[PDB]
Design a protein around this ligand. Structure first.
Ligand SMILES: Nc1ncnc2c1ncn2[C@@H]1O[C@H](COP(=O)(O)OP(=O)(O)OP(=O)(O)O)[C@@H](O)[C@H]1O
Ligand SMILES: [Mg+2]
Lengths: 296, 183
């Protein structure tokens, strides 16, 4: 069963495992994935067809290189480019002493770009969250699990069984709005950014109503002013509490002026006003952006 | 782990809405989908073993086959269980007139000491909503806030998951009354 070498389990989320391995020949790394159908199963796994696709169309520095794939009928495997650990791991294993203000930016920066790259190909990542952001020894950060990546204008659809994490969903999606945009991905990162900083996840969610309120309680209960057209958003209600913005003074003090204006705009209510991926890679904040190499 | 562990049933106390009865909640019996598979017949038997008279299902023929439990309703039929099908759109909320029948029938069952169990697919959404509604329905003093905690106590902090559900609960009392159109 395929010239290879399962060594250690780097991961295993939502029906599937990501073992590590060597070329059963010259070895040379490997992050071999895995996914399972077994025939006589529900409509073949989509997890992938599109994900292998978008992974191909997409070939940029900060974007996992889907080295190869083994189509075996039994179970489908996807040879990936091994890459040490994901940002959740790292973030975690650093949450006591924090991460180098530069390495942060070196990391955010390589992301915004790689992101803006996909965005430019008419694609939305949608599953942006630490465990899906990979890092390496020299201070290089890639993207992954393009497993939920779709092309612009896919609608918001909800399912009784489709019960996910939510920590990184943007207000426009929680308040219910047909389809979503790239504004979403520039929001997951909003959070993720303020998390590498403060070390603790910005808005921890258990129920959509909690996810919000947290946000509102932190970023002010949005009003027509900051967000034209909320009071009309399908699932909006005048009733929700009205928490006045919790000024950055508590939000991300470990930061400065540049960071504190970017994030601000990087987590803006109005999707139509939230900053673009490119409009980001500009910001004074990234001026002297080097490539700090991390310690693990 | 999984499938051959007897089918669980969360029994909700309806005392804080002043009812001595208990309402039962569980996930799809026999469900085979995403890291979740079971034996219909066996689950179905365990229920009868468990004492179940009436069973409220909120899935849809559409869903019963997609989870490979098409005959579910029948297995229930020929198992001694009086079933009440009240499909509720997946990821949706019931229209007030439907939601109304549920409350009624549900209430009756209780009034008449029937061992009632309700469910949809995941038992964390549709059914939590519906159970939460019965609380607002057997009591005009209980707060949406509260009924929610009630289910959260029963099923976990992931109780009413969605926001549409949360909104719906805070508006059930009105829309239910607004069904004032005696006609
Ligand atoms: N190339 C790689 N190098 C290092 N670690 C990797 C690599 N590919 C995957 N991983 C690890 O595997 C996990 C991510 O895998 P993957 O995206 O397949 O998971 P998933 O379960 O499908 O999605 P999610 O993780 O978003 O739930 C993480 O724990 C990550 O550290
Ligand atoms: Mg992932």
């Amino acid at each position: 069963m395929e010239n290879f070498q399962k060594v250690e389990k780097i991961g295993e989320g939502t029906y599937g495992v990501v073992y590590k391995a060597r070329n059963k020949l010259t070895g040379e790394v490997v992050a071999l994935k895995k996914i399972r159908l077994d025939t006589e199963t529900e409509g073949v796994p989509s997890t992938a067809i599109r994900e292998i696709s978008l992974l191909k169309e997409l070939n940029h520095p900060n974007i996992v290189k889907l080295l190869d794939v083994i189509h075996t009928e039994n179970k489908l495997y996807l040879v990936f480019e091994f890459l040490h650990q994901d940002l959740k791991k790292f973030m975690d294993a650093s949450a006591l002493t924090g991460i180098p203000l530069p390495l942060i930016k070196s990391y955010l920066f390589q992301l915004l770009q790689g992101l803006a790259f996909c965005h430019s190909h008419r694609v939305l990542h949608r599953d942006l969250k630490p465990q899906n952001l990979l890092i390496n020894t020299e201070g290089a950060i890639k993207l992954a699990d393009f497993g939920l990546a779709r092309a612009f204008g896919v609608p918001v659809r909800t399912y009784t069984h489709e019960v996910v994490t939510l920590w990184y969903r943007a207000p426009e999606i929680l308040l219910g709005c047909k389809y979503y945009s790239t504004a979403v991905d520039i929001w997951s990162l909003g959070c993720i950014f303020a998390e590498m900083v403060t070390r603790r996840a910005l808005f921890p969610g258990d129920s959509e109503i909690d996810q919000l309120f947290r946000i509102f309680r932190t970023l002010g209960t949005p009003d027509e002013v900051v967000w034209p057209g909320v009071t009309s958003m399908p699932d909006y209600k005048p009733s929700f509490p009205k928490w006045a913005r919790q000024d950055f003074s508590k939000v991300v003090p470990p930061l400065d002026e540049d960071g504190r204006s970017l994030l601000s705009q990087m987590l803006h209510y109005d999707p139509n006003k939230r900053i673009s991926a490119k409009a980001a890679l500009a910001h004074p904040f990234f001026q002297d952006v080097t490539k700090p190499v991390p310690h693990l | 782990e999984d499938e051959q562990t007897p089918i669980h049933i969360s029994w909700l106390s309806l005392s804080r809405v002043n009812c001595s009865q208990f309402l039962g909640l569980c996930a799809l019996p026999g469900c085979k989908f995403k890291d979740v598979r079971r034996n219909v017949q066996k689950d179905t038997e365990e229920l009868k073993s468990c004492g179940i008279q009436d069973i409220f299902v909120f899935c849809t023929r559409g869903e019963l086959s997609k989870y490979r439990v098409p005959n579910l309703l029948d297995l229930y039929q020929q198992c001694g269980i009086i079933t009440h099908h009240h499909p509720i759109a997946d990821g949706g909320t019931p229209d007030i007139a439907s939601c109304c029948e549920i409350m009624e029938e549900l209430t009756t069952c209780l009034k008449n000491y029937r061992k009632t169990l309700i469910h949809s697919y995941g038992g964390l959404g549709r059914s939590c909503l519906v159970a939460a509604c019965l609380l607002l329905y057997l009591s005009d003093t209980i707060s949406p806030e509260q009924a929610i905690d009630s289910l959260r106590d029963l099923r976990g902090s992931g109780a009413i998951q969605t926001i549409k559900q949360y909104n719906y609960l805070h508006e059930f009392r009105d829309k239910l009354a607004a069904h004032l159109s005696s006609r």
